[PDB]
């Protein structure tokens, strides 16, 4: 029982594991997002004005 | 009147509250956030580092 | 810086002789002459006396 | 005759003790040797 209650823990913590290495694709993939478009200040200032 | 039509749905979104930094410029509010923890945790480098 | 080259190695170990005027007691007897007295009462403020 | 007492002192009585987790351990004599297995799971 021990060894089959302590296998469906292991493959839960690698499956919690396969979400929530996901979960950090987006917040990757957003601030990648962003910086393709970011020029930098002394590009933008000038034009800002 | 277009507005209604322009929330799409962002309206009616129950409002809850969220935990973060905040900071106070000129008129404008910003919030603050810096990540390094969810990128050296993983040990992957980080974008802001240029 | 001389109030702490003083030792306090004391063999007495409980005779309590003067005490201030608000509870505290005196650690020493700084003597000196006139002279030095009317500069040492500007600078340092005399607070008890 | 004049003697003096040197002042006594406490482990647990000074800021010290805020770098140590303290548990009295009675026969340390019988011990060979200690171990903490850490197991640290790591995000990707």
């Given at each position: 029982?021990?060894?089959?209650?302590?296998?469906?823990?292991?493959?839960?913590?690698?499956?919690?594991?396969?979400?929530?290495?996901?979960?950090?694709?987006?917040?990757?993939?957003?601030?990648?997002?962003?910086?393709?478009?970011?020029?930098?200040?002394?590009?933008?200032?000038?034009?800002?004005? | 009147?277009?507005?209604?039509?322009?929330?799409?749905?962002?309206?009616?979104?129950?409002?809850?509250?969220?935990?973060?930094?905040?900071?106070?410029?000129?008129?404008?509010?910003?919030?603050?956030?810096?990540?390094?923890?969810?990128?050296?945790?993983?040990q992957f480098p980080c974008p802001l580092?240029? | 810086?001389?109030?702490?080259?003083?030792?306090?190695?004391?063999?007495?170990?409980?005779?309590?002789?003067?005490?201030?005027?608000?509870?505290?007691?005196?650690?020493?007897?700084?003597?000196?002459?006139?002279?030095?007295?009317?500069?040492?009462?500007?600078?340092?403020?005399?607070?008890?006396? | 005759?004049?003697?003096?007492?040197?002042?006594?002192?406490?482990?647990?009585?000074?800021?010290?003790?805020?770098?140590?987790?303290?548990?009295?351990?009675?026969?340390?004599?019988?011990?060979?040797?200690?171990?903490?297995?850490?197991?640290?799971?790591?995000?990707?």
């Amino acid at each position: 029982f021990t060894e089959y209650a302590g296998a469906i823990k292991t493959i839960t913590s690698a499956l919690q594991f396969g979400m929530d290495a996901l979960e950090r694709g987006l917040v990757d993939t957003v601030l990648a997002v962003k910086l393709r478009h970011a020029p930098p200040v002394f590009i933008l200032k000038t034009l800002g004005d | 009147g277009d507005k209604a039509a322009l929330a799409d749905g962002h309206d009616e979104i129950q409002r809850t509250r969220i935990a973060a930094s905040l900071v106070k410029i000129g008129d404008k509010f910003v919030a603050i956030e810096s990540l390094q923890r969810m990128y050296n945790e993983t040990q992957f480098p980080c974008p802001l580092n240029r | 810086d001389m109030l702490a080259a003083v030792c306090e190695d004391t063999v007495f170990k409980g005779v309590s002789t003067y005490t201030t005027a608000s509870g505290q007691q005196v650690a020493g007897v700084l003597e000196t002459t006139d002279s030095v007295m009317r500069r040492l009462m500007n600078l340092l403020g005399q607070v008890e006396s | 005759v004049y003697t003096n007492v040197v002042e006594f002192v406490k482990f647990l009585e000074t800021a010290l003790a805020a770098a140590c987790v303290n548990t009295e351990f009675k026969d340390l004599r019988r011990m060979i040797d200690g171990k903490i297995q850490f197991k640290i799971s790591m995000p990707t």
